[PDB]
Symmetry: C3
Subunit: 273 residues, 3 copies
């Protein structure tokens, strides 16, 4: 791919709020334009070094939270990270909780998801003539999931070690009836809007992708229903802990994901017809 400036490469992608990026840590940061066949990524990708590991930061909503979940150019974002050479992708996300023990301020490292989106326009990179059906039974990268859990537990933070993420379309939040389906019918644990098709595309790109979720709310279930103000406030209250985990995990990603704990790392070997 063409990049400007030319020649830029990276090894770990970080997708999340622009507040995760700390200019006090990242060595030799550069804003990079990475061409894609899908147009612009959400914002500049900031590439720089953390403990000698080259990181590409990409705020999925753009700086300033300009781009709501349904409007994100997921294809461009994942294509650009892959084009840079990344092997690992850490997503950081705000989620609602469907269970009392997943409390606001707790981290969750989900292991499963249920896609209830509808309007994301492209759920794949492969529209033909090579038909590709990736296996996503185990859709996250187990290597990276375990690294995230370990980091949180070493830092003394609550990090729930599993969870099913229901991805809804939004931007409006769930009705009570919908939330009861998510909680009591689907038996899901957390809820968000951005996982899908991000994760699909990451898998197809043979990336080791995992989500570090932060519970920001209990959806409809507490005294007052979730609001955007609530989500943003709680996220910003907890962003420093998310940064501590990121900067703890990244230095340990200098190597490669373990193939036998990376469901997608050879996804295309058996997926393409």
């Amino acid at each position: 791919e063409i990049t400007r400036p030319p020649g830029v490469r990276a090894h770990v992608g970080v997708i999340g709020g622009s507040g995760l990026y700390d200019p006090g840590i990242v060595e030799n940061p550069v804003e990079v334009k990475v061409s894609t066949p899908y147009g612009n990524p959400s914002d500049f990708i900031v590439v720089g070094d953390v403990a000698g590991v080259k990181v590409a930061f990409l705020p999925r909503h753009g700086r300033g939270h300009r781009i709501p979940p349904h409007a994100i150019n997921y294809r461009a974002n994942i294509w650009a990270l892959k084009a840079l050479g990344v092997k690992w992708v850490i997503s950081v996300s705000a989620v609602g909780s469907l269970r009392e023990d997943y409390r606001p301020g707790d981290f969750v490292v989900p292991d499963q998801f249920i896609d209830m989106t509808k309007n994301r326009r492209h759920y794949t990179f492969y529209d033909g003539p090579v038909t590709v059906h990736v296996s996503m039974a185990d859709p996250f990268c187990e290597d990276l999931r375990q690294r995230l859990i370990d980091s949180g537990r070493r830092l003394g933070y609550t990090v729930h070690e599993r969870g099913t993420y229901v991805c809804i379309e939004g931007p409006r939040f769930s009705t009570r009836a919908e939330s009861r389906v998510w909680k009591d019918v689907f038996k899901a644990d957390i809820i968000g809007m951005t996982l899908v098709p991000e994760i699909n595309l990451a898998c197809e790109a043979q990336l080791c992708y995992a989500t570090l979720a932060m519970v920001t709310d209990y959806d409809v279930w507490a005294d007052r229903p979730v609001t955007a103000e609530e989500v943003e406030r709680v996220m910003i209250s907890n962003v420093e802990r998310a940064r501590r985990m990121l900067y703890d995990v990244i230095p340990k990603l200098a190597g490669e994901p373990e193939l036998e704990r990376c469901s997608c790392c050879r996804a295309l070997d058996t997926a393409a017809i």
Copy 2:
């Protein structure tokens, strides 16, 4: 917004079949073109007075039922009503029933919904750069719901005082397997095709929106499955009762929705980032 004729305003919107509009009641009716950034509303909006309350009538399918649910320009419709100044929106809708006691000819004033649509292309007005996530835990306007229930009970009509509306994509009707999911898995009460994204957009526009549903059929559950002919016949058989309720409720809407019984009336106060 530009209107033709210029200067037109209204206080209550009525969305439903064009047969709800009664030229024998509405004073000084005018067909109005309201510019929108989304193109044409379903039809002309007819503005006129009912007991001194200014009403804007908008047939969501167009006159003659020209526009099926998936083809409606929901954004244009709601933008136009908001641009006219409306505070209240009464939707009148035909629905199927998933429960024996919600009989054809009965009114239902739903309180919840489950969105099973997929192809409506825009589920919001807010695509950036201001990200908006409205709370829709309680998606209808309680003030108006209670007014509709009261009117029906004063007229002597059956009006079920709650219900979960499952909105399906259509235009084809549900399979038996789908209907069993709606009824037995989701525990929904009624089924229709037009609620979503109408309601989402109304909430984002800070309107007090409520649905007066008329049960027209039992979906798959009676001896013969629902047909369009059946829906239309039963609706037209009952339209006069729907008109009686409309013309009973509207005169009492000269004032404002009660903020504490209007979940969406200040939706943007905590929804925008």
Copy 3:
């Protein structure tokens, strides 16, 4: 419709893999271009005779499996078959199983479906001004279903005589959490990606459409999750049996579907407003 070569007609459509077409059987085969208002069908339609019945073969993925499920021009495919004059449509499909007794290599003739797609862009031919809502309580053509079951049982093959097909969006395969919803919550039997909106459009076109499914895998439920390689291998291992059933059934379709066992054959009589 214009066709090239001109004047081509057919009585039975066959939709499935191009490997179903046997040049050793089909008399006087011709590749036909059938104009549609939706652009190109997936590939040429090959028209020829089987035991004096005129068949139109249409590989939904194209020759070479060029077109994944979400990219198929369903409208063009069904319009073209209808334009040729077909009355019957046999779909042949690979499916996953959600139940141990529906084993790889077994045929299934589903009777129901649950549409979990989202990105197919058009779910109907009718976008106005004639609004059409077809009844699909019983979405397959019972006449043809029973013919397929009979053929399999006469050939000595396992053919499950009912089933609920959950149609997912793809192209990625289901997560374990999703598969548990399909199996344990929706109580579905098989899973695929191509049924919808094919079946909707066939019903609207007043065709007698039925699916001959071949189980190729157990989705997430066996020791290793489904892969595309697995599906393709098992399908190609079993294609000859599918051909035997096709060439056994087709000669018996010289006449018309029985109206009282064809839910869609007069669909438009009560569907159009």
